[PDB]
């Protein structure tokens, strides 16, 4: 019965040990720690030890200063793994070690009061008391060069950002004090092993000040890097070689969903990196909120559990067991492509910013912070304590933070075009490519007669939108471009019109039609690719790591689709932080594209609208291309365009729903042959037929699919006196094309804006202000004829839609 | 051999989940082979040691295999090991290892009954109507007695109301057969699958009843979540139970309804999950039932999550997860019934993963064996819920041939009452001002401290200033606000006020909660004005709360706690008005347009600071313009008040005119301490809410308003920057007319004030906002349409149009300002 006592205290220590860890440098609970003969006899465990043995093991290991939790991995070589490494006696640290780790302490910390006393304003930047995330992050740095990686990516909130700089990124002090906006900026640098002979890039991306936002853009970034290196998922090889390094905070780790969203892509095909290496800088405080009121879960990183992520709670007053724990969870990363969290409990020493006397609202744990000396004050003391280090090194040590002082002040004082027509033997190519199955494939029979009418599209004509875009993406392909096609139920489609991945019907095999054109007719590869995937159930995670894929390869084209355009304003964040904005703040490009499905067709107010007025709001100084195709064939050229005219600039696409199989809205060989993309389009009958623009005294300005309504409804009255001009491009505003095409309709007495959106929605807003003022010769008393201005897209009854749909037409030939 | 047992009996424990015959489609075939942890020989046990005696008390090595195989490898899968408190654990163990005995007849023929009903409703939808194929719950039906088993035992329990959200897949159906609405209310005159609901379910077995409520929700899976918790939190609060209240019944539950991809996928549900046992939003446990059909569109779940089960985000609380076999309706009932008792007694989330499957296409359009041709041959093989465990219960002799057919007439008679009662259908069819002793009594409130309390040095004064104030004037904005909700709860108006670090304030000006220097105790002066001078209490409470670092969960919660408690002040306040956008799905589904879509209604008030001051453009806008642009036909209250008594009288007409609409304030950061931004005790004793304001030298001053020839039209702190110019030259010529009501647009207020400036020959629009952002892309088009004769040649003073809210730069922003207010006085 002894035997099995000590088997239940073995699990306990390694299921709850944890709980007992002597984690917190600040000791705030005290609670939190409240036979003899057995102790000296041997125990079967096959191996024999003494209980007293087997008993300091697991205290050691478990109960120290790091706290582990494994036990929740439901893959059991994963805990074996973890459980054979943490329960070995290790060798302690060499000396030559240990001064290493003290040197990076005194450079953190030397920064530390460097920013303090050189310059105001900067407490809320203030890493002192978290300084042992500087050698933490170094000793991350150090395993991936020992394993032979090829880059470090870090992602982080703006507390010790420039430290990191400095510290981690190795930039100079000339660079980093030059002129705030340097806490949001990316950065290159080379990290050089001390005492090895390796060297791997690290670069820090861009951030807002969005906690957490940056999530699903490290990981996007990194994957672009893995993709282009043939490492990973996408790769040759299964090293991964580009690591995500992600820092955080511990209120905003617990309380962001954009985290769980981001550790939810972990292991999926389109979007693992090879595992996250994850550092949360717990300092117990979240502005002036304590953890009881930030978060449900004993820890802050309980949010990984969901992901079965080993988890480390680790004493940052103990440098050694944070470097031992990062080398741990690099080597862990390595082993089994898998995120892993290390928990540093820390403390903020100063308070959140300069208005802040943070004894105020935490009066307890700032008298137990004004008691605490340095994390460096403390390590050197203890090497002394422990014997470690002479006390002429410990003066030297000593003497290093001084020269490390003066030289950031002293440094800092010396300082003081083309064409998108393709050929119709391409569009050929791309036709055959359908039909070109792999041998015993079996076609379901529904999507057989898409893949031939695709071939007696891309022969005779007529093509719809859907095959235009892989026309368009095809051709890309072929030329050597990269392509990169994700959204819900994107392989697909949501409205079945895509098929970019067919499904055998036998053996569940996917087949990518468009891969074929990566391989040029004499078998040799175009340089190109097809990335197609079903994405998550996300919004948010997943535009921000499209927009990261794009920032990570530019010469990728990237392109991301909602199911619905309504559903975007799920990724509000990512469309305000980055994408429209990120030129203007940080100089980051991004050339990402979203697909958002828009119109007004009776499906209800989530099912309408990808809010274009949001989007025309955001635009400013050609920051974006927006676009509301009208046709295949200009669909096609946009997508051409943007692939090729080297403006890394985001697009912005308001793609059909049912035009996707209006028998009016398809395009000739000749129109993706011998044409380009068109931001201002007239009626056929003007440029190709016998038109009169003469006899036109009301011109209608439109976009979009109402445009084929109101052609059929001039049709059937024989309205020659009524002119259509759709405006295919919605920013920046074609203002030379726009005056030319006006100009051909002398005898026009009146202008109207025809749209099926709300008068508050819509490009009404924007193009009602912007119009009079851009063209004031041809748009002074422009009029409106829209839905009137609703507090949401739509209506939710699809007989209230028809009555207003017919309400606009009649007013539009009134 | 006895620590091999004791392993044995752990892996049961941790592991038996990962073995247990949960799938009804059993799809993954590699599942029950491989699993070493769990057999005997793995362990280093034989045959013969499963007759002898163990201690674990004394059992058979094989009746101790037993009991964990039928507790843990059957059809139900439970995790709890993750549990961290031990006595949670214990209470599962328990209650799961122990043999229970077989269900009566009675029961097994009202669950069969419950079945009936929710296959007979299915048939008709889909045979009645075209387009349903989307909300089809076929193959998922056992939702149906097993919610009627949740509500049933929170009937048991004594509760007062469940109340469910939860996505379209089989709305209609728990309208029925759960909500209990007729078939004349679901089927007359879609919206449906999106409106509220409410209704009595009355015990079959029992003589208890409870109230049953479904909320209003949009398209947007999950968004919900988080205002089922407000909603439930506010009726909680009313009720006197819960976290708030003397009794610790937490008396009513939150039903939330789930999928398999949008759990695993949105992240909304971490942050909602997060909230669970906060004080400010604990709602003492939510029973969390997933509808696991194991796909998501054409989605397979290999790309929809990252982890083996889709409820793997609920460890993150420490919640117990239950997968059970959709196939088996009696331990999915059981099940429902074990997760109501746990939430009754630990006041934490429960989870059940109902294995099941979607029996047709996503929607009209689909085919599902196009993308999951393997899944659909194995769903084409299965025969309903209904009809499997009506074949179940004749094989094991629990009923007869006779019993059978009857409940199959059941079935024709459930089915027929559908049809017939829908062809009968078919055939047939305020003063905001206060006294002066109400500001003292507040202002007396914050020197009014508990025996022995130690104030922080630093709190002290704005105690002592507060009283001064009170008294003498000069009434700060800060102040005011506490002025405005403190005379509300004096009213007996309840007041929930939360965001991130709002007891204190972001810019340490409030001090809502005041926390002891020695013991970390809180005083909360508000609190006072719930209690009369005679001691009887006046029926109002003070809420205020610190949030969790979420601003999607947050913002649902108020508006969610805004519609259960419709007579509550609710107030969220965004740390700066930058990260609101965080919420834009509440913002966007819910608070703007909730009214229009569904008739619920919201008062809920969002506070959000705003104004440029060289803090970069994550900490300058709110984005007025966005809130302009989503505002249409009176739906929301959107203003920008520049003085601390227009403030106090907007936020007491708030809470006052009986008006259910949200009010959107972009509140200030400096001008919180500008000296010029104060007020005088008589702006909160004689007057009232201002929406257009003039300057004060030409309502209470010498000035002369026909010198003026210039008008400037403006919003916000910027006034004060342009008065002091105005002074500064001695710009007779020029006047600043302030609008702080933006949405509605006070038009007459408007016209009759500038009617008062006959010689005005130009007027500006002057805004610290870039051209295309602030209320120049709304106020520039609506303006000189709605008032023709005063806006014909409206011109534009602000910010060039940009990408972002600002400059990085606090260098750019400080010329551009002065860049302003010189074109202002060119
Ligand atoms: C709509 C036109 O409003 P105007 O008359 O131009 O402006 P004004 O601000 O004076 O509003 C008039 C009244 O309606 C009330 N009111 C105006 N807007 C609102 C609102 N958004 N919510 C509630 N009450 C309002 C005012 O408080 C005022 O009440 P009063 O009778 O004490 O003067
Ligand atoms: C999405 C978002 N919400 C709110 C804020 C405002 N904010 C800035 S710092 C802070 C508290 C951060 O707490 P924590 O994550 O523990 O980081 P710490 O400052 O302690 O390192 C908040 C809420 C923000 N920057 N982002
Ligand atoms: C936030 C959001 N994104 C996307 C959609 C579009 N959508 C509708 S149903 C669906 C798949 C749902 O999967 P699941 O959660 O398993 O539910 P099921 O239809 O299988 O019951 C999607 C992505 C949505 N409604 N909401
Ligand atoms: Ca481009
Ligand atoms: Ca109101
Ligand atoms: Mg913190
Ligand atoms: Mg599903």
Redesign the pocket.
């Known amino acids: 019965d002894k035997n099995a006592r000590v088997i239940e205290l073995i699990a306990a220590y390694r299921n709850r040990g944890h709980l007992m860890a002597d984690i917190d440098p600040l000791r705030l609970d005290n609670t939190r720690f409240r036979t003899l003969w057995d102790l000296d006899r041997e125990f079967k465990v096959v191996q024999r030890k003494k209980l007293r043995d087997i008993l300091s093991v697991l205290r050691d290991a478990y109960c120290r200063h790091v706290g582990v939790e494994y036990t929740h991995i439901l893959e059991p070589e994963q805990q074996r793994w973890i459980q054979e490494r943490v329960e070995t006696k290790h060798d302690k640290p060499t000396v030559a070690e240990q001064k290493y780790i003290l040197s990076k302490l005194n450079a953190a910390e030397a920064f530390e009061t460097f920013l303090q006393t050189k310059y105001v304003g900067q407490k809320?930047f203030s890493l002192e008391g978290?300084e042992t995330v500087i050698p933490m992050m170094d000793a991350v740095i150090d395993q991936c060069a020992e394993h032979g990686l090829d880059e470090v990516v870090i992602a982080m909130?703006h507390?010790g950002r420039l430290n990191v700089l400095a510290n981690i990124v190795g930039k100079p002090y000339s660079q980093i004090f030059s002129e705030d906006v340097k806490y949001h900026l990316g950065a290159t640098g080379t990290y050089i092993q001390m005492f090895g002979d390796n060297d791997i890039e690290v670069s820090l991306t861009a951030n807002?000040?969005?906690?957490?936002?940056v999530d699903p853009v490290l990981e996007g970034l990194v994957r672009a890097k893995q993709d282009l290196l043939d490492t990973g998922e996408e790769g040759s090889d299964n090293r991964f070689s580009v690591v995500p390094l992600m820092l955080?905070?511990?209120?905003?780790?617990a309380?962001?969903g954009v985290v769980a969203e981001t550790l939810n892509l972990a292991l999926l095909r389109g979007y693992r990196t090879g595992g996250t290496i994850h550092i949360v800088?717990?300092?117990q405080?979240?502005?002036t909120?304590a953890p009881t009121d930030?978060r449900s879960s004993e820890y802050?990183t309980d949010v990984a559990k969901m992901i079965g992520a080993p988890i480390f709670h680790v004493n940052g007053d103990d440098p050694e067991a944070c470097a031992w724990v990062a080398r741990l969870a690099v080597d862990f990363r390595q082993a089994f492509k898998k995120d892993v969290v290390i928990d540093m409990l820390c403390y903020?020493r100063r308070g959140?910013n300069e208005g802040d006397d943070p004894s105020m609202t935490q009066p307890y744990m700032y008298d137990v912070i004004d008691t605490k000396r340095g994390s460096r004050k403390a390590y050197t003391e203890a090497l002394i304590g422990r014997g470690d280090i002479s006390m002429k090194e410990a003066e030297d040590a000593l003497r290093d933070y001084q020269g490390q002082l003066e030289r950031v002040f002293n440094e800092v004082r010396e300082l003081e075009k083309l064409a998108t027509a393709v050929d119709k033997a391409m569009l050929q190519r791309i036709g055959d490519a359908h039909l070109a199955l792999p041998e015993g494939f079996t076609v379901h029979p529904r999507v057989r007669p898409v893949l031939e009418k695709r071939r007696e599209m891309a022969y005779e004509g007529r093509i719809d939108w859907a095959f235009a875009e892989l026309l368009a993406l095809g051709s890309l392909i072929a030329e050597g471009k990269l392509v990169r096609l994700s959204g819900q139920d994107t392989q697909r489609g949501t409205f079945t019109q895509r098929h970019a991945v067919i499904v055998d019907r036998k053996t569940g095999e996917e087949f990518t039609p468009l891969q074929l054109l990566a391989t040029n007719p004499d078998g040799t590869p175009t340089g190109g690719k097809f990335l197609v995937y079903n994405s998550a159930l996300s919004e948010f995670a997943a535009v921000g790591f499209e927009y990261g894929y794009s920032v990570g390869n530019p010469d990728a084209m990237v392109l991301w689709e909602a199911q619905f355009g309504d559903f975007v304003n799920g990724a509000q964040?990512i469309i305000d932080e980055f994408i429209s904005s990120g030129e203007a703040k940080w100089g980051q490009l991004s050339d990402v594209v979203l697909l958002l499905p828009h119109g007004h067709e009776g499906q209800g107010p989530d099912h309408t609208s990808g809010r274009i007025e949001r989007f025309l709001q955001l635009w400013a100084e050609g920051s974006m291309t927006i676009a509301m195709p009208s046709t295949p064939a200009n669909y096609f050229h946009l997508l051409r365009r943007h692939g090729k005219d080297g403006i890394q600039r985001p697009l912005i696409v308001f793609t059909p729903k049912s035009m996707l199989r209006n028998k009016a809205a398809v395009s000739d060989i000749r129109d993706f042959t011998e044409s380009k993309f068109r931001s201002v389009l007239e009626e056929p009958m003007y440029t190709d037929g016998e038109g009169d623009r003469n006899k036109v005294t009301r011109l209608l300005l439109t976009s979009g699919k109402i445009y084929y309504e109101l052609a059929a409804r001039k049709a059937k009255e024989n309205r020659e006196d009524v002119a259509i001009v759709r405006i295919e491009q919605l920013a920046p505003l074609p203002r030379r094309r726009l005056a030319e095409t006006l100009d051909r309709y002398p005898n026009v007495k009146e202008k109207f804006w025809v749209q099926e959106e709300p008068a508050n929605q819509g490009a009404w807003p924007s193009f009602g202000l912007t119009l009079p003022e851009i063209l004031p010769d041809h748009f002074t008393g422009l009029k409106r004829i829209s839905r009137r201005a609703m507090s949401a897209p739509s209506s939710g009854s699809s007989k209230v839609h028809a009555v207003e749909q017919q309400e606009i037409l009649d007013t539009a030939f009134g």
């Open positions: 809320r978290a909130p507390r807002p000040s969005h906690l957490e936002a955080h905070g511990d209120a905003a780790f309380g962001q800088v717990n300092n405080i979240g502005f909120t930030s802050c903020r959140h964040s």
